[PDB]
Amino acid sequence: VLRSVNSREPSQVIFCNRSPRVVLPVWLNFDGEPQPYPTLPPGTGRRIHSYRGHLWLFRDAGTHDGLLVNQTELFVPSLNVDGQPIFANITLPVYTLKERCLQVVRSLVKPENYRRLDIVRSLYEDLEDHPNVQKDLERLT
Amino acid sequence: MDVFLMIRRHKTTIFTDAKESSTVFELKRIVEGILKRPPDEQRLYKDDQLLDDGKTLGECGFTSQTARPQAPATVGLAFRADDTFEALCIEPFSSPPELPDVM
Amino acid sequence: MYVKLISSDGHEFIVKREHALTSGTIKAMLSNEVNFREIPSHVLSKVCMYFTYKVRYTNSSTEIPEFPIAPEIALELLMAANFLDC
Numbered sequence: 647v648l649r650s651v652n653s654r655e656p657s658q659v660i661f662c663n664r665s666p667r668v669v670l671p672v673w674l675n676f677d678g679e680p681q682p683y684p685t686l687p688p689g690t691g692r693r694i695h696s697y698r699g700h701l702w703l704f705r706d707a708g709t710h711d712g713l714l715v716n717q718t719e720l721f722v723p724s725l726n727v728d729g730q731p732i733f734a735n736i737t738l739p740v741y742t743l744k745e746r747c748l749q750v751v752r753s754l755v756k757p758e759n760y761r762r763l764d765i766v767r768s769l770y771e772d773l774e775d776h777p778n779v780q781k782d783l784e785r786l787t
Numbered sequence: 788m789d790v791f792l793m794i795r796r797h798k799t800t801i802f803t804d805a806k807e808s809s810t811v812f813e814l815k816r817i818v819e820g821i822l823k824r825p826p827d828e829q830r831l832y833k834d835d836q837l838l839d840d841g842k843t844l845g846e847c848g849f850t851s852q853t854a855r856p857q858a859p860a861t862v863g864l865a866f867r868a869d870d871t872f873e874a875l876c877i878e879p880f881s882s883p884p885e886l887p888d889v890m
Numbered sequence: 891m892y893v894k895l896i897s898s899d900g901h902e903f904i905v906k907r908e909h910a911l912t913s914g915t916i917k918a919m920l921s922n923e924v925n926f927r928e929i930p931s932h933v934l935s936k937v938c939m940y941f942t943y944k945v946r947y948t949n950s951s952t953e954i955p956e957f958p959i960a961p962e963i964a965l966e967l968l969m970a971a972n973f974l975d976c
């Protein structure tokens with residue numbers, strides 16, 4: 647269901663990383679499979695050729711934490727007005743304090759050790775339940 | 788521009804915001820609304836320096852880029868008990884324990 | 891309008907009522923002081939800064955900075971965040 651439409655109509659786009667993370671752009675191909683593209687360092691931009699009706703999302707390249715693009719989850723290139731590219735402004739969401747604490751704890755503890763932590767079993771499961779593109783495609787469907 | 792502050796005395800801490808252009812005295816009015824003590828019974832400090840009433844918060848070094856929502860600037864508060872002012876005293880927060888081995 | 895949140899070691903944190911209602915657990919404990927017997931002040935101070943950060947940057951196109959968390963407090967903050975549902 648979530649897949650790019652095969653329009654064959656070019657649309658030039660600027661990916662603009664205004665996050666402090668290294669960004670992984672993901673294209674959803676014509677069968678809905680996520681396809682990763684080259685990463686963008688913090689604060690950098692890339693001018694890229696995409697197509698009308700194509701679907702993109704953006705993740706932290708190291709941890710797969712979710713990012714926003716023009717304030718939402720999904721970016722779809724539109725028709726270019728007077729040869730101007732479309733801006734995709736990539737930013738941090740306001741994470742919940744719980745999700746933000748899980749991110750920091752995951753960045754400090756190897757997965758083999760999550761169980762040694764003195765915390766409730768439901769938090770062990772929250773740590774192990776890493777952010778992942780597949781899981782979010784199931785969610786957004 | 789908004790500045791984000793923690794106003795602190797003993798074991799009390801107030802989180803509030805104010806304008807860079809607002810005055811020390813206007814911040815004492817805010818404290819008055821919360822702790823019920825008038826401005827004349829209050830002294831405000833930045834570190835060990837007593838702040839003058841007519842100065843703006845910006846002039847006193849509270850700016851929008853240092854007094855941030857996620858890391859607010861500390862303003863010290865002392866009360867006058869009857870005749871004279873107590874000395875500035877801010878009880879520190881508790882100490883985090885040692886990092887566990889796995890961290 | 892303000893509410894008082896008190897840490898396990900007796901620190902009193904005074905925050906706007908609407909900021910504290912970020913937490914469903916705090917709304918329920920008020921429905922106006924709340925004592926937290928398990929949350930020490932070095933954690934509760936950070937929870938109050940999160941409320942300020944959340945209210946300031948929710949629904950704003952002005953670029954969003956990372957909410958910082960020292961490694962030393964991360965585990966206790968996680969437990970507190972789980973309890974408070976925020």
Ligand SMILES: Cc1ncoc1-c1ccc(CNC(=O)[C@@H]2C[C@@H](O)CN2C(=O)CC(C)(C)C)cc1
Nearest residue numbers: 661671673683684685686692694695696697700
């Ligand atoms: C340099 C860069 N950094 C991040 O992403 C890129 C980058 C590099 C090259 C391209 C080339 N354009 C494409 O691959 C477009 C994007 C997407 O709409 C799919 N696509 C296609 O041409 C359709 C294909 C993959 C050929 C069936 C797009 C993005």
